[PDB]
Amino acid sequence: SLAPEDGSHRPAAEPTPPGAQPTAPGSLKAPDTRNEKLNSLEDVRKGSENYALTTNQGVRIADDQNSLRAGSRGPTLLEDFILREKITHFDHERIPERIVHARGSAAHGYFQPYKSLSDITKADFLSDPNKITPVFVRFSTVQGGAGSADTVRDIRGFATKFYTEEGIFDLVGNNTPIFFIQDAHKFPDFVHAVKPEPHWAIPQGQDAHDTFWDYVSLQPETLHNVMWAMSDRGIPRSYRTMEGFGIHTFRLINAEGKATFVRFHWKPLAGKASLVWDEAQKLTGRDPDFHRRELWEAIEAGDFPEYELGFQLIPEEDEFKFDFDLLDPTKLIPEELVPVQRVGKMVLNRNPDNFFAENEQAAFHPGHIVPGLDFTNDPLLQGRLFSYTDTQISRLGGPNFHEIPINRPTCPYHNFQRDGMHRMGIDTNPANYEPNSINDNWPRETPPGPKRGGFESYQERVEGNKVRERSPSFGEYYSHPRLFWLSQTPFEQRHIVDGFSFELSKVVRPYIRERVVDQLAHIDLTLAQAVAKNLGIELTDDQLNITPPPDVNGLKKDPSLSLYAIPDGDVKGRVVAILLNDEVRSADLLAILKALKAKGVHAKLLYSRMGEVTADDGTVLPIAATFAGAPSLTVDAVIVPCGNIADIADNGDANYYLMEAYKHLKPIALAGDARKFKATIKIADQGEEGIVEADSADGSFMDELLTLMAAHRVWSRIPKIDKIPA
Amino acid sequence: SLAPEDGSHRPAAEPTPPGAQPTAPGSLKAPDTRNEKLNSLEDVRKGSENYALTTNQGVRIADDQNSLRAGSRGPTLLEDFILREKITHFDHERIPERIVHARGSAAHGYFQPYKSLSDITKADFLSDPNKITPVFVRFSTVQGGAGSADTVRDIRGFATKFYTEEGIFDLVGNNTPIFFIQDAHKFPDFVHAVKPEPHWAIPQGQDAHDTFWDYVSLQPETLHNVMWAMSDRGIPRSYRTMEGFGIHTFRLINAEGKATFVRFHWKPLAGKASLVWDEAQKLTGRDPDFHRRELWEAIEAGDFPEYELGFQLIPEEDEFKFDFDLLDPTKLIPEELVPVQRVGKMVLNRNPDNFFAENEQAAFHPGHIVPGLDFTNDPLLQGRLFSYTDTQISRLGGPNFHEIPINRPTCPYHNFQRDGMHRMGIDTNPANYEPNSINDNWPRETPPGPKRGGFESYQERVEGNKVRERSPSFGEYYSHPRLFWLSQTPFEQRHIVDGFSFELSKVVRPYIRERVVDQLAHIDLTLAQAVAKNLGIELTDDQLNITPPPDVNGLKKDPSLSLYAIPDGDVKGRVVAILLNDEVRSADLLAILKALKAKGVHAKLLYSRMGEVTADDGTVLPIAATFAGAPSLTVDAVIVPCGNIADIADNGDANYYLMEAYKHLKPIALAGDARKFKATIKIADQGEEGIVEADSADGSFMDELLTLMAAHRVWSRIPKIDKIPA
Numbered sequence A, B: 001s002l003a004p005e006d007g008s009h010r011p012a013a014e015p016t017p018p019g020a021q022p023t024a025p026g027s028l029k030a031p032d033t034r035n036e037k038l039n040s041l042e043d044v045r046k047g048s049e050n051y052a053l054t055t056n057q058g059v060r061i062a063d064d065q066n067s068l069r070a071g072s073r074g075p076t077l078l079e080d081f082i083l084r085e086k087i088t089h090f091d092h093e094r095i096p097e098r099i100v101h102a103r104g105s106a107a108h109g110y111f112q113p114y115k116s117l118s119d120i121t122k123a124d125f126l127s128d129p130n131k132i133t134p135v136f137v138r139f140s141t142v143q144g145g146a147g148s149a150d151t152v153r154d155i156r157g158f159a160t161k162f163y164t165e166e167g168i169f170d171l172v173g174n175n176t177p178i179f180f181i182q183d184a185h186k187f188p189d190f191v192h193a194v195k196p197e198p199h200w201a202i203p204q205g206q207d208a209h210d211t212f213w214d215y216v217s218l219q220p221e222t223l224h225n226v227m228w229a230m231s232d233r234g235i236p237r238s239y240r241t242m243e244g245f246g247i248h249t250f251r252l253i254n255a256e257g258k259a260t261f262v263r264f265h266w267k268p269l270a271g272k273a274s275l276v277w278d279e280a281q282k283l284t285g286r287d288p289d290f291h292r293r294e295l296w297e298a299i300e301a302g303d304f305p306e307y308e309l310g311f312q313l314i315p316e317e318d319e320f321k322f323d324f325d326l327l328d329p330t331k332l333i334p335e336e337l338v339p340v341q342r343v344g345k346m347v348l349n350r351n352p353d354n355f356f357a358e359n360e361q362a363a364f365h366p367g368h369i370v371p372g373l374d375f376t377n378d379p380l381l382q383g384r385l386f387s388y389t390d391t392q393i394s395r396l397g398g399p400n401f402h403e404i405p406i407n408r409p410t411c412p413y414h415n416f417q418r419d420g421m422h423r424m425g426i427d428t429n430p431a432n433y434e435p436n437s438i439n440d441n442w443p444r445e446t447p448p449g450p451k452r453g454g455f456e457s458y459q460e461r462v463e464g465n466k467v468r469e470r471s472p473s474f475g476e477y478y479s480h481p482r483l484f485w486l487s488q489t490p491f492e493q494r495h496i497v498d499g500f501s502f503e504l505s506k507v508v509r510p511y512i513r514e515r516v517v518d519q520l521a522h523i524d525l526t527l528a529q530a531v532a533k534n535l536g537i538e539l540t541d542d543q544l545n546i547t548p549p550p551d552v553n554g555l556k557k558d559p560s561l562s563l564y565a566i567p568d569g570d571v572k573g574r575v576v577a578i579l580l581n582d583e584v585r586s587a588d589l590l591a592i593l594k595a596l597k598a599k600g601v602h603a604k605l606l607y608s609r610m611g612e613v614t615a616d617d618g619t620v621l622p623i624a625a626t627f628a629g630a631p632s633l634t635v636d637a638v639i640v641p642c643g644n645i646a647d648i649a650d651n652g653d654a655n656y657y658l659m660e661a662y663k664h665l666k667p668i669a670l671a672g673d674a675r676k677f678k679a680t681i682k683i684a685d686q687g688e689e690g691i692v693e694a695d696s697a698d699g700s701f702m703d704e705l706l707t708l709m710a711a712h713r714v715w716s717r718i719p720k721i722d723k724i725p726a
Ligand code: HDD
Pocket: A098, A099, A100, A101, A104, A138, A139, A140, A156, A157, A158, A159, A172, A173, A174, A178, A179, A183, A184, A187, A246, A247, A248, A329, A362, A363, A364, A380, A383, A384, A387, A388, A389, A391, A392, B087, B091
């Protein structure tokens, strides 16, 4: 018995806030959170407590500390089969990572529609507001390996496996509404250009290098998603605070056989929020697991990630009514033209038990659809359909990857397919072919119908010659980038310009930077000029004279394309650093902590060392982390309570904490003599918007602080931060 | 033609300093740098210029921009074999990464001994000072994935493949002279404990988590290598500036059959140097590829990494003469007891062409020895011999991994082994077995002898019963950690305290922190007290009374265990940041660059934007990076030349660049009016050792700066940095 006698090794099996208890496998942390998929995994869940340690063949091991040798200082013997089994399993633990989105974090949850959608689709999982469908969702970055950092600038994946009663449906989306390229034949080129360069394998998790911008400069179709990635969309605060999109136009098919075109959306109920670049980049060093950690801890705290599924629906007869082609995945459908109709809610409420078994081995593929859905001729979607089945043959070791437990349907599956590596199902059917008489032709085909019918493809008319040709309706590259640019606030536009400027500064061949700037001048001259000024490049008179691309269907902006133009803040689940001193005003700390708790905001008590400090009144304050150990990068706001401020006033870490939080536009609140830190951040005596200050933490101090947190960051501080040495 | 007309897309094929040209594949950057192994890869090197783009079956492609479809807006057709080949190859690009040391950076080079070693070994590669052996070297971290960062705190691997005339010898070592564990049976336990925890797969590239410290606390044999990892050895400045060690005692066998015990060492001819923790951690975010990049760029510059191979030799009759067991890999052999004899020099002088083909697929294994070497019964080495052949069957896809080009011997290899996946060699032998008469028994066994003989194991006597038992002589755990502690300078000791304090602050379960401090009390009470104080732990009276462990064979210290106690600085290949302004004094820059060039130190010119600035005399200066884009983390020292200092005096990033460099103990040199930056880092008028200042940058100013850079960091400044907010 090596556990502490007080039982403190084991986290409580109840919701607890971030940092309050060690994290644990979901079935131990939250044994009563169930759904039909979680329950179906019980056949493979393995416990440990009270069991003997064995080999994989069930033989009990007596001494798991030593190899078998001839003499206690002698050579290891070949006959040690316990050693060799254990080292062999170790030696073959790794499987190939995903070719793209190798870095990702996943959770289980459930989805339910708000009302039946039978009028527009026969998909069973959308047929009844009381039908609950379990989900497994993985969120990811794109470029970096499985061991890369989370808060890089990149697109994010947002992949949802719906375990429906009529089959698995995987909605395999990203967090921006378009992709970089038009036709899947170019996917290896694009991916190779953004991935680490092939001679030296640098850089990891960064588009900031020559080959990515070379390809962008040569393929202007890429510019629209490049605009999104260079905005603060590329650096989300959390997977809970980003949008999701299926990108492609798909079809819904109802029981009468009518097709409606659809694009899929996820709206985050926590709101949209992103980091700023300097914070994101520094956070990749201070905590490369920050998004993975934040998702796991939100679920352990009960701050369940919630998202609303929504559809943009366009009738078949309106296919050609826009200035862009609906089948072109580099174009978005502005919500001002086609609104998102709310469909249902997804809540992620339990972590996995074992990351490798459930996250690493999960296989999502957008070809996994169900009756009631269908594809379109989008030429990027069409090639995706080939890739996601083919890649699993190496990644997951063969054609039986649907028998890996996380991938299994919860509905029935029966067919004539047999064998393959790793075959788990032992088929008893006398027949392995159809048509057969020897088993009365079972299992049997099922005609299509309104419910529980076979899959039949929508009978779309095809007419044309066999060509490798891009549709001319796809040959427009700048109007969507411009619509995105004009829809952003002034501070978002600044962050875009700073994104392009920072990334192009890392491109060693200057002509590439020049070619990118020339493309920017086809989108918007103000953008192009601002980036050029940061790169020391002067636009030519020709460039100054490029006419801007047209409006998109009459629109000159669409505010739903901005993260921040329309307030959607939610403070629940956010966190505040509280910088302690060795004699904290206890009345301040009571008021601060209860106000935060009332709004579901978490706190971390920080000091210059671990252990405890004692408040003016004798209250013992346990310390969560030191100032350097939990930097301001990891919090949303900073509060400094009154007390003995001299204890920390000359602490360089405490001062720099406030300087970093101030640079990154975070709300900062200072009570009583903590206002002596105004000099560290150069705040005027009469104060400034974004800094809460008062004689004590009472009255409206915490409400003012919370109001600032609901607006996420103090954008008005931006011109004040250039001078700050931080 | 898409290339620029000026040819500026292609780097010069001559040695160039870091940043001067885009980096390139080895064979294009240094086509005239050759060795027998590099030449032998010519059968598989493939160029590209002037060749048509084809499928892998050699069919020319006309249109590599589009899939084949039925009409230009129609569905993709299954008969598009060009698209499916291209996407199939992409879909199967990844192979499993190495179970441990998945993150590593490699280069080609050559070794030669200083004199023949035939008196102590018959190994051919050590027989003649003028017989050169090609090598391929891979340096690595241990815990993190292939996409993790370089400048983590961790042990580093240092693996050298020697392509000898009598077979491949792989010397598969680390940068510390011992390992964490004694018997290979525990390796999966220890690796699992240090790797990301299994529920949530956090943390990447960090031992700072509960499971690793839980295992440490329960297995005191780990503490010696834990001391090394928590010292600045854990955060080297470059792979050029760390030591290498084979760890285990092996044998040398001479022609007369005499066995000598040997432990292997690499001495870096660039000297020993490490980062400091705050700089290393922030560097993992600002450039997670810093060591990979620095190695590739040093080779491109001609700053070839050089290492001296060294042997500690112990006669067979002296096996039991020390107070530790020579076969225990948690024990080092102090160089005060047994000196390192210099054996030869290895120079790494060409980077690979393709990182995946040559680095990712290289297989090193310490069981690849040659005649003249042999193993010992060290129980960690004994089990390593099983693992490195086993693991390549999944990582490299089967038993023909020696036919992957980088792994091929350059000497002859012929045997009766056949088939296996991706069999390259087509054997013409009518026989695939021996003994055979049908091929007159070829290829034939060869008796052992003085040179070119068959391998025979040294006939060590084995006497003992079949037991799984640890030798009692291995059961001592604190004397080597203590010798290490006592051998460090006071600043190195402070860094060890800080590393333990930082790491244990991240362990959520307090009793684990407590148990590790109790282990530290068994090593040294001053260490244990200093760590306990940072964790808010008070040692008990019993802990204060633990008797220190014995000296190691009478030693109270061995200064060879310190990075810094004996000077061995070499400035060649280091880099300085020069912070420009828009009217630089050309006379300063002349003097600066002259003095740097004389000592082989590179410069990077930084400014507040990219493009160019013009100096006082009209010299146009191209800017390498912005102050934010290439932070002080990435350089060894900072120079600020005179000129229009008002241009940059209030620039936040320029002032922060100096505060960060100052915190991290780097030399800083300020010329003329640049001395106004003294205020930012609170230097008094009379100046401070470590800050060079004069009216202009002259010979004297540069000599002083260069002398500082030879001492690597300004340790005496440590007391002054606690108060700097940076
Ligand atoms: C033709 C190839 C191809 C193209 C054009 C795309 N992808 Fe893809 N995608 C892959 C081929 C691929 C892949 C090779 O099949 C991956 C990696 C391994 C896997 O299981 O699937 C994958 C993984 C993958 C994942 C991670 C799923 C997971 O968590 O395991 C997401 C979220 C996306 N992709 C999303 C997209 C979106 C939104 C695209 C454009 C609209 C896109 N993919 C285009």
